[PDB]
């Protein structure tokens, strides 16, 4: 899967960088109270999934 | 060395350990934003 | 008259000194003065 394990990983990196900035801003703008709470839920679940995906793919490139 | 699969991330790994001190610095950026109230 | 917020100017000023200092510490390991 080589090139696509590296794509899962940079997906994870990218998503982390977005979550790092976005989660605190989301949490402190209670203007976007509800609009945004759905997004972090998605982001969080997608993050956990990318970690799992990268963890199994590791045992096909290590 | 990292496993070769991860080697492209070597430069990122090189700088990660300094991140905790940026938090301490961030606290001061933040207090300046609120005028050290 | 105050158009630019002080906290912004402080952070930018601050990060500018970090870089110059950082460079000076890089230089202790390279070129003149590195023992090499």
């Amino acid at each position: 899967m080589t090139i696509l394990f590296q794509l899962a990983l940079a997906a994870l990196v990218i998503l982390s960088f977005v979550m790092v900035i976005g989660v605190p801003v989301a949490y402190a703008s209670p203007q976007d109270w509800d609009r945004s709470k759905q997004l972090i839920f998605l982001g969080s679940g997608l993050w956990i999934a990318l970690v799992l995906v990268v963890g199994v793919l590791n045992f096909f490139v290590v | 060395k990292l496993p070769e699969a991860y080697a492209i991330f070597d430069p990122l790994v090189d700088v990660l350990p300094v991140i905790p001190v940026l938090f301490l610095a961030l606290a001061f950026v933040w207090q300046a934003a609120v005028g050290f109230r | 008259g105050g158009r630019i917020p002080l906290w912004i100017v402080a952070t930018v000023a601050g990060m500018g000194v970090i870089v110059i200092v950082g460079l000076f510490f890089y230089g202790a390991y390279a070129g003149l003065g590195s023992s090499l």
Binding site: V25, S29 | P11, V15, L22, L26, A33 | -
Partner: peptide, 30 residues
């Protein structure tokens, strides 16, 4: 190289002040 290191730490470093900046624009709860 050292480019990638410095480009990395440039991006990480900007991340902190951005958060503060964004919350100040959006008149958030600093």
């Amino acid at each position: 190289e050292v480019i990638a290191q410095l480009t990395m730490i440039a991006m990480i470093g900007i991340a902190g002040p951005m958060i503060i900046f964004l919350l100040a624009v959006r008149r958030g709860n600093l």
